[PDB]
Symmetry: D2
Subunit: 116 residues, 4 copies
């Protein structure tokens, strides 16, 4: 699988478990088409979103449902979600890890891109 | 003005100058309606986007044009833009600063909400 | 003043107020000599630590007492303190802002160096 | 091994390879005693620093040699090193991952602490 998402909780010093993630791909008409979705495991990782065949060139949006995460923990956070928007596979297939580090009023996101 | 945006460059250790910033408000039909826009100053700041009267409760999106920033510096970046989506909440008097710290393959964003 | 320190709280979305900050300068024998100190203001800022005359080239350490900050808020943190170690370099006129963004198990620090 | 260090490069979107790391432990006389050292692999990870037996309670400092990393890449960075200082194992043995995300003028560090 060429797309993985990893989420950490900066309050607890732990993986962020059970975080919902929705991936979209920009369609020819400029709308965001649902592409794939899942939730993070006990390790804070989400594997198996897509395949080499399916993950073609395009502009992708990874929406990490941070508010739903903090609210399921009984906490009122600032952001609705974290949105990570990027062009993928434009120089041929790559493997993408999208990492996010969450706090109630702040987040960071990093991409690790490797060539198989 | 209840909304300020501040952008920093983690590669050069500087304000991120002349970055385009677009603010949108979510409409009743779930589309994003243009609300305010500008370019960051020499201090990396964008002041004067809105007023207390106009900045009512609702869901807002701040889009920071990071890709153009990096390309103007001759650097290849990962993201198309950085997006910050939040609800404005009246809960007594409030000022919102949306801060962003930019690297080519990473960004951080923080909200500083004060009275 | 060529050195300012700014501290933000990522849990509350606020300046980090009343945080103790200690600055040290590396001596010829490789020990850390006290240089300047203070507590962050209501804006999370600490101004007036030094002067252009005193802030000569050399290696400096800024220690931010994060542990006491979190404990005063009734929160259990990971780090003893946050440490920022850098060389001051004359290279024309320079102002250094050391910014820190605090969470219980994580922190970020950035240097904004301007003329 | 109960102590692991992971380093990413935010400029390249890659693991930070060949980063030197020195760990110290505060001694009874309040000095920093050398405890362990190593360098990050091709994955950006440093394994095998210590053992359960050796990694007793204490105050530890993990020094990540960021300037040496950026200078080996021909880049002039701001910081000398990143220093991560923490009390370990005070409620019994834990596993610690110290992560760092590097840019020339900025870094972040996060701890992930798990109970085996
Ligand atoms: Na192409
Ligand atoms: Na632009
Ligand atoms: Na204190
Ligand atoms: Na104990």
């Amino acid at each position: 699988c060429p797309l993985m998402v990893k989420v950490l909780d900066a309050v607890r010093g732990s993986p962020a478990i059970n975080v919902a993630v929705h991936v979209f791909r920009k369609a020819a008409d400029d709308t965001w088409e649902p592409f794939a979705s899942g939730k993070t495991s006990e390790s804070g990782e989400l594997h198996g979103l897509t395949t080499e065949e399916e993950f073609v060139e395009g502009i992708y949006k990874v929406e990490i449902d941070t508010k739903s995460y903090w609210k399921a923990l009984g906490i009122s956070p600032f952001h609705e979600h974290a949105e990570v928007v990027f062009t993928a596979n434009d120089s041929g297939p790559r493997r993408y890890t999208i990492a996010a580090l969450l706090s109630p009023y702040s987040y960071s996101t990093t991409a690790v891109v490797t060539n198989p």
